[PDB]
Amino acid sequence: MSPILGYWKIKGLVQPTRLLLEYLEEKYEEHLYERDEGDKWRNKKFELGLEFPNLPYYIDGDVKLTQSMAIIRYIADKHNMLGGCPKERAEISMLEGAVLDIRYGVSRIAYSKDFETLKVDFLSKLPEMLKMFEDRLCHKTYLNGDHVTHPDFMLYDALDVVLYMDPMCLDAFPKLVCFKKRIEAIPQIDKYLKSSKYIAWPLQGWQATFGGGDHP
Amino acid sequence: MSPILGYWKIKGLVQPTRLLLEYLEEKYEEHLYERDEGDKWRNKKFELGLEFPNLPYYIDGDVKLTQSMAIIRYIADKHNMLGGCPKERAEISMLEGAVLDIRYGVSRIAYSKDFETLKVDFLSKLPEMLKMFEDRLCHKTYLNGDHVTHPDFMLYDALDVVLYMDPMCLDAFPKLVCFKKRIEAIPQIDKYLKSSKYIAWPLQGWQATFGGGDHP
Ligand SMILES: N[C@@H](CCC(=O)N[C@@H](CS(=O)(=O)O)C(=O)NCC(=O)O)C(=O)O
Ligand SMILES: N[C@@H](CCC(=O)N[C@@H](CS(=O)(=O)O)C(=O)NCC(=O)O)C(=O)O
């Protein structure tokens, strides 16, 4: 049967994974927990056969997984996209980590009552983080070269998110601007982003001071 | 020449990596930044050839890496320890993530002025996190079975850290208590923990409210 991907009906930690699945054109069903289905999840949490019960989870005829990163890596690995040798795989793991520093950098302050104050500090450090990627993309179409890897969708998600926080944070980074457009230019992605499956909001959990709520 | 591992002279994000290197008996030199060498690092940060300048970093005749997780995975991968197939590698990635939830759970609140209040909330959720590992170890010597994998050293580091926070947090988890002793029973580990190379403190950056300072 078709693999089952479970998570809240938000972008959050699973969006990059959804994009990788669409890009690979893999078939899959989603168990989406609405903002008021917290209890629905609780009563099912310890009943899915998961060794480390959590959201997101990925269940398919061969495995039962939790931990967003093990999930996206599993999907990529099943398609030989993790790297052909130790060095390459490390490059790709390094790219994941660097993207997470930005994505997690947002979530870390998005649930605070003093978001604006934290935001200033954050938007103050973001430029140096972005420049590392800008330089990475100066002589590359995608993060790992001519071919797409899962970090590309992670970066895309992170850029999508920081753009909501500051629509001008990419003004000094033309390569990153083109990269985001380039990802949206991928047929499978453009199709998915225009379909009824696409969850455009919220970015974080509904209760978040930033990227939360039921509407943009 | 011998690989170079660089980081602050604290356990922090690199300790599990140091333990994996010792276990594998790999030769390596460390560029340790003292509490007052922040500037020493700044003036070298963008001069090491690192694509994503950060701490820790790992430089050896074949690669230049940053991102603690890409580093430990690289070392494990160079020894064929990441997993023999997609499923196994995902299991191992899942274990990393689950350990990080605990380790990062500590760092997230260790720099706050209200540590004690946050600590209560944290120590309230830790038991459910620990039990997942307790159950994982009920019919296994190590997290992935009979043989050691890098997540074992990550878990060890996390247990070492939560024990400083609460010396009794493992009282209901005998398998975890034995697991920690079992890791310390590994010849290379026992030797390293008794050598002059072992950095017992601090756990977090020196400025941390918890696990910080120059002395326990
Ligand atoms: N490290 C885990 C963290 C997962 C996590 O924090 N999940 C949250 C939701 S969200 O933060 O991703 O929105 C949750 O509610 N998990 C279910 C639970 O805690 O019962 C991962 O990456 O998968
Ligand atoms: N995701 C990175 C985070 C690294 C990080 O936050 N490094 C801190 C130090 S510590 O938090 O690990 O102690 C640092 O000072 N990096 C150097 C810098 O920011 O210039 C990783 O895992 O390697």
XYZ file of C-alpha atoms and ligand atoms in Angstrom:
478
model
C 0.000 0.000 0.000
C 0.917 3.682 -0.319
C 3.267 5.038 2.376
C 1.643 7.096 5.129
C 3.131 10.449 6.151
C 1.687 11.868 9.363
C 1.938 15.363 10.816
C -0.025 18.443 11.810
C -1.699 20.305 8.963
C 1.091 22.898 8.951
C 4.320 23.228 6.970
C 6.634 22.871 9.951
C 9.247 20.118 9.965
C 7.673 18.017 7.201
C 7.239 20.484 4.294
C 10.689 19.731 2.783
C 9.761 16.045 2.898
C 6.465 16.686 1.134
C 8.349 18.578 -1.584
C 10.886 15.733 -2.035
C 8.038 13.203 -2.411
C 6.308 15.366 -5.019
C 9.581 15.903 -6.901
C 10.215 12.154 -6.919
C 6.573 11.674 -7.855
C 6.180 9.092 -5.100
C 2.643 8.103 -4.157
C 1.697 8.644 -0.523
C -1.206 9.375 1.792
C -1.142 11.892 4.628
C -2.626 11.619 8.109
C -3.146 15.315 8.815
C -3.912 16.424 12.361
C -6.023 19.575 12.497
C -5.479 22.306 15.067
C -8.165 20.723 17.252
C -7.147 17.086 16.833
C -4.423 17.052 19.463
C -6.339 14.355 21.334
C -6.822 12.342 18.160
C -3.025 12.182 17.963
C -2.517 11.422 21.657
C -4.814 8.392 21.516
C -2.971 7.075 18.475
C 0.603 8.091 19.376
C 1.581 4.931 21.232
C -0.558 2.712 18.983
C 1.158 3.012 15.582
C 4.068 0.667 16.235
C 6.540 3.552 16.299
C 9.661 2.943 18.400
C 10.072 6.663 19.085
C 6.479 8.027 18.876
C 6.490 11.584 17.536
C 5.345 13.823 14.663
C 6.139 13.526 11.859
C 6.029 9.786 11.256
C 6.389 7.733 8.081
C 4.817 4.306 7.688
C 5.238 2.150 4.587
C 5.310 -1.573 3.825
C 8.975 -1.759 4.863
C 9.512 0.712 7.710
C 8.017 2.706 10.583
C 9.865 5.982 11.137
C 9.778 9.173 13.194
C 12.246 12.112 13.271
C 11.776 14.422 10.286
C 15.428 14.070 9.230
C 15.523 10.285 9.287
C 12.348 10.401 7.202
C 13.573 12.724 4.450
C 16.925 10.924 4.362
C 15.168 7.566 4.083
C 13.168 8.728 1.093
C 16.283 10.199 -0.557
C 18.321 7.053 0.237
C 15.663 4.869 -1.386
C 16.432 6.797 -4.578
C 20.224 6.851 -4.178
C 20.286 10.571 -3.455
C 22.343 10.667 -0.223
C 25.767 10.654 -1.870
C 28.001 8.267 -3.795
C 30.838 8.273 -1.275
C 31.684 9.342 2.294
C 32.860 12.789 1.200
C 29.766 13.514 -0.873
C 27.389 12.233 1.805
C 29.163 14.454 4.354
C 28.799 17.466 2.041
C 25.080 16.758 1.857
C 24.812 16.268 5.646
C 26.688 19.531 6.109
C 24.182 21.265 3.847
C 21.289 19.864 5.902
C 22.780 21.160 9.144
C 23.459 24.616 7.727
C 19.884 24.867 6.484
C 18.517 23.725 9.853
C 20.467 26.474 11.628
C 18.297 28.921 9.687
C 14.993 27.026 9.827
C 15.402 26.177 13.503
C 16.647 29.711 14.046
C 13.129 30.841 13.183
C 11.203 28.259 15.207
C 13.364 28.979 18.253
C 11.995 32.521 18.544
C 8.621 32.153 16.810
C 6.776 31.089 19.969
C 7.964 33.918 22.196
C 5.955 36.838 23.506
C 8.904 39.088 22.609
C 9.182 37.928 18.992
C 9.936 41.394 17.574
C 12.923 41.895 19.861
C 14.262 38.412 19.154
C 13.556 38.928 15.445
C 15.920 41.912 15.326
C 18.732 39.841 16.801
C 17.916 37.006 14.402
C 17.609 39.136 11.269
C 20.955 40.581 12.304
C 22.717 37.221 12.007
C 20.756 35.792 9.056
C 22.792 37.679 6.384
C 26.026 35.847 7.231
C 24.164 32.545 7.185
C 22.557 33.377 3.813
C 25.839 34.519 2.284
C 27.354 31.071 2.884
C 24.640 29.667 0.635
C 24.902 32.552 -1.823
C 28.580 31.668 -2.293
C 27.757 27.978 -2.503
C 25.419 28.746 -5.411
C 27.661 31.114 -7.365
C 28.910 28.308 -9.595
C 26.148 25.733 -9.049
C 22.553 25.288 -10.195
C 21.611 23.452 -6.997
C 23.374 23.023 -3.656
C 25.173 19.854 -4.740
C 25.711 20.813 -8.372
C 23.652 20.020 -11.468
C 21.283 17.623 -9.685
C 18.695 18.194 -6.963
C 19.261 16.718 -3.481
C 16.993 16.876 -0.442
C 18.881 19.822 1.074
C 17.585 21.906 -1.845
C 14.008 21.478 -0.642
C 15.069 22.176 2.925
C 16.750 25.413 1.824
C 13.691 26.294 -0.247
C 11.464 25.828 2.807
C 13.801 27.973 4.921
C 13.832 30.766 2.317
C 10.064 30.577 1.996
C 9.882 31.076 5.767
C 12.403 33.896 6.230
C 10.732 35.741 3.357
C 7.496 35.905 5.355
C 9.514 37.269 8.283
C 11.331 39.800 6.109
C 10.364 40.131 2.395
C 13.625 41.997 1.783
C 16.092 39.632 3.461
C 17.118 38.320 0.040
C 17.711 41.678 -1.692
C 21.485 41.328 -1.388
C 21.461 37.665 -2.382
C 20.481 37.346 -6.079
C 21.678 33.724 -6.354
C 19.340 32.740 -3.508
C 16.466 34.618 -5.150
C 17.038 32.750 -8.411
C 17.463 29.481 -6.540
C 14.019 29.841 -4.959
C 12.498 30.620 -8.354
C 14.443 27.731 -9.886
C 12.901 25.275 -7.424
C 9.444 26.656 -8.183
C 10.262 26.158 -11.875
C 10.566 22.402 -11.363
C 7.447 20.886 -13.046
C 6.509 18.585 -10.149
C 6.975 21.410 -7.667
C 4.973 23.986 -9.650
C 2.203 21.425 -10.026
C 2.199 20.587 -6.304
C 2.265 24.244 -5.268
C -0.815 24.795 -7.419
C -2.721 21.710 -6.249
C -5.207 21.222 -3.397
C -2.606 19.232 -1.434
C -0.370 22.254 -0.851
C -0.538 23.586 2.714
C 0.501 27.239 2.489
C -0.095 28.067 6.134
C 0.714 28.053 8.964
C 4.530 27.896 8.966
C 4.821 26.936 12.623
C 2.330 25.445 15.033
C -0.929 27.408 15.106
C -0.106 28.811 18.546
C 3.102 30.495 17.366
C 3.424 34.276 17.676
C 5.074 34.227 14.241
C 3.980 32.030 11.351
C 1.027 30.786 13.362
C -2.743 31.162 13.254
C -5.161 29.808 10.665
C -4.414 32.536 8.135
C -1.410 34.458 6.707
C 48.700 14.411 8.324
C 46.425 13.780 11.311
C 42.865 15.141 10.991
C 42.135 18.369 12.861
C 39.020 18.667 15.032
C 38.254 22.211 16.159
C 35.892 23.458 18.853
C 35.666 25.292 22.156
C 37.286 23.550 25.109
C 33.889 22.323 26.314
C 31.948 19.098 25.765
C 29.081 20.698 23.870
C 28.240 19.473 20.377
C 31.545 17.685 19.741
C 31.925 15.338 22.753
C 30.114 12.412 21.047
C 32.481 12.866 18.105
C 35.520 12.802 20.374
C 34.238 9.562 21.912
C 33.682 7.955 18.471
C 37.253 8.864 17.430
C 38.686 7.367 20.620
C 36.577 4.215 20.215
C 37.780 3.841 16.628
C 41.275 4.650 17.852
C 41.668 7.234 15.099
C 44.564 9.661 15.412
C 43.631 13.338 15.467
C 44.698 16.731 16.759
C 42.380 19.277 18.349
C 42.306 23.047 17.926
C 40.764 23.981 21.269
C 39.465 27.508 21.779
C 39.666 28.647 25.393
C 36.973 30.741 27.042
C 38.967 33.877 26.216
C 39.972 32.974 22.663
C 36.770 34.080 20.971
C 38.780 36.566 18.916
C 41.338 33.919 18.015
C 38.459 32.017 16.409
C 36.932 35.064 14.714
C 40.196 35.923 12.958
C 40.530 32.353 11.724
C 36.860 31.552 11.012
C 36.777 32.704 7.399
C 40.383 31.628 6.768
C 40.227 27.825 7.106
C 38.710 27.042 3.717
C 35.403 26.032 5.292
C 32.355 26.476 3.048
C 30.067 26.970 6.047
C 32.399 28.440 8.735
C 31.308 27.308 12.195
C 32.345 25.311 15.279
C 32.959 22.446 15.319
C 34.983 21.888 12.164
C 36.887 18.858 10.893
C 39.852 19.156 8.550
C 41.725 16.162 7.147
C 43.659 15.380 3.970
C 40.408 14.639 2.121
C 37.728 16.978 3.480
C 36.877 20.253 5.216
C 33.695 19.970 7.279
C 31.501 21.902 9.701
C 28.168 20.906 11.324
C 28.679 18.504 14.228
C 26.343 15.900 12.698
C 27.962 15.836 9.276
C 31.270 15.421 11.100
C 30.331 12.456 13.291
C 28.508 10.824 10.377
C 31.544 11.309 8.144
C 33.799 9.574 10.633
C 31.301 6.719 11.072
C 30.788 6.442 7.285
C 34.543 6.161 6.753
C 34.322 3.005 8.870
C 31.113 1.641 7.326
C 29.088 2.327 10.456
C 26.121 4.275 9.011
C 24.048 1.254 8.005
C 24.112 -1.519 5.417
C 20.846 -0.562 3.740
C 18.269 2.255 3.568
C 16.202 0.811 6.414
C 19.164 0.382 8.746
C 20.579 3.822 7.956
C 17.144 5.330 8.668
C 16.985 3.491 12.007
C 20.347 5.002 12.892
C 19.280 8.489 11.725
C 16.119 8.113 13.785
C 18.229 7.266 16.824
C 20.358 10.384 16.270
C 17.294 12.620 16.117
C 15.746 11.114 19.240
C 18.978 11.634 21.157
C 19.250 15.234 19.937
C 15.743 15.983 21.221
C 17.134 15.284 24.691
C 20.575 16.872 24.282
C 19.175 19.947 22.551
C 16.363 19.931 25.086
C 19.000 20.780 27.680
C 20.905 23.409 25.697
C 17.645 25.156 24.807
C 17.015 26.103 28.442
C 20.562 26.082 29.836
C 21.263 29.713 28.923
C 18.148 31.212 30.480
C 17.907 33.346 33.589
C 14.889 31.251 34.621
C 16.629 27.880 34.276
C 15.016 26.341 37.379
C 11.498 27.032 36.135
C 12.290 25.728 32.656
C 14.092 22.754 34.215
C 10.899 21.632 35.962
C 9.009 21.631 32.675
C 11.899 19.811 31.004
C 12.420 17.199 33.715
C 8.684 16.630 33.446
C 8.921 15.502 29.819
C 12.305 13.736 29.976
C 10.884 10.467 31.440
C 8.798 9.720 28.337
C 11.801 10.461 26.144
C 14.044 8.202 28.268
C 11.514 5.372 28.321
C 11.631 5.154 24.515
C 15.326 4.356 24.838
C 14.783 2.101 27.847
C 12.436 -0.003 25.705
C 14.851 0.114 22.789
C 17.521 -1.402 25.044
C 15.434 -4.116 26.695
C 16.594 -6.722 24.192
C 19.750 -5.031 22.874
C 23.275 -4.429 24.157
C 23.592 -1.187 22.188
C 21.053 0.982 20.369
C 21.486 -0.860 17.071
C 22.063 -4.322 18.514
C 25.294 -6.161 19.308
C 27.565 -3.543 17.719
C 28.291 0.068 18.653
C 27.127 2.886 16.344
C 27.659 6.625 16.714
C 24.215 7.175 18.255
C 25.461 5.201 21.271
C 28.032 7.888 22.043
C 25.453 10.597 21.456
C 23.081 8.915 23.916
C 25.944 8.474 26.372
C 26.720 12.197 26.166
C 23.043 13.060 26.682
C 22.784 10.779 29.734
C 26.004 12.199 31.131
C 24.426 15.651 30.815
C 20.952 14.973 32.225
C 22.587 13.206 35.167
C 24.303 16.457 36.155
C 20.911 18.176 35.923
C 19.176 15.462 37.937
C 21.271 12.599 39.436
C 18.065 10.609 39.940
C 16.504 10.940 36.484
C 17.638 7.401 35.663
C 16.328 5.653 38.802
C 13.355 4.204 36.926
C 15.431 3.261 33.891
C 17.825 0.405 34.813
C 18.622 -0.451 31.171
C 19.805 3.127 30.594
C 21.897 3.004 33.770
C 23.583 -0.196 32.599
C 23.985 1.216 29.105
C 25.942 4.194 30.443
C 28.149 1.874 32.491
C 28.516 -0.427 29.484
C 29.883 2.419 27.363
C 32.316 3.337 30.133
C 33.355 -0.332 30.180
C 34.613 -0.085 26.600
C 38.458 -0.197 26.859
C 39.101 2.765 24.541
C 36.462 4.819 26.325
C 37.678 4.009 29.852
C 41.200 4.882 28.753
C 40.106 8.185 27.185
C 37.983 9.147 30.189
C 41.044 8.639 32.377
C 43.500 10.487 30.126
C 44.574 14.148 30.048
C 42.622 14.678 26.809
C 39.235 14.240 28.486
C 37.351 17.518 28.951
C 34.953 16.914 31.843
C 33.607 20.448 32.013
C 31.844 22.603 31.054
C 28.870 20.870 29.399
C 27.623 23.977 27.621
C 29.330 27.227 26.748
C 31.011 28.807 29.775
C 28.353 31.526 29.938
C 25.497 29.050 30.425
C 23.402 29.251 33.598
C 23.470 25.442 33.659
C 26.487 23.321 32.774
C 28.610 26.430 32.393
C 31.491 28.052 34.247
C 35.062 26.817 34.573
C 34.231 24.275 37.266
C 31.529 21.676 38.101
N 13.192 15.926 16.376
C 11.808 15.637 16.074
C 10.941 16.728 16.703
C 9.436 16.492 16.440
C 8.522 17.437 17.211
O 8.965 18.306 17.981
N 7.215 17.223 16.953
C 6.128 18.015 17.554
C 5.338 18.828 16.543
S 6.194 20.055 15.572
O 7.026 20.789 16.497
O 6.934 19.337 14.579
O 5.095 20.805 15.067
C 5.084 17.122 18.162
O 4.012 17.645 18.530
N 5.345 15.822 18.264
C 4.342 14.933 18.831
C 4.428 14.779 20.318
O 5.306 15.398 20.924
O 3.608 14.018 20.831
C 11.742 15.613 14.545
O 12.539 16.293 13.894
O 10.906 14.901 14.012
N 24.450 23.315 13.660
C 25.805 23.669 14.019
C 25.752 24.643 15.196
C 27.164 25.087 15.641
C 27.159 26.207 16.675
O 26.106 26.708 17.103
N 28.402 26.565 17.060
C 28.672 27.610 18.064
C 29.333 27.083 19.325
S 28.479 25.852 20.294
O 27.115 26.313 20.413
O 28.609 24.618 19.580
O 29.217 25.915 21.510
C 29.668 28.608 17.549
O 30.140 29.433 18.359
N 30.009 28.556 16.264
C 30.988 29.500 15.745
C 30.399 30.783 15.245
O 29.177 30.936 15.315
O 31.196 31.597 14.779
C 26.476 22.336 14.362
O 25.789 21.408 14.795
O 27.677 22.228 14.177
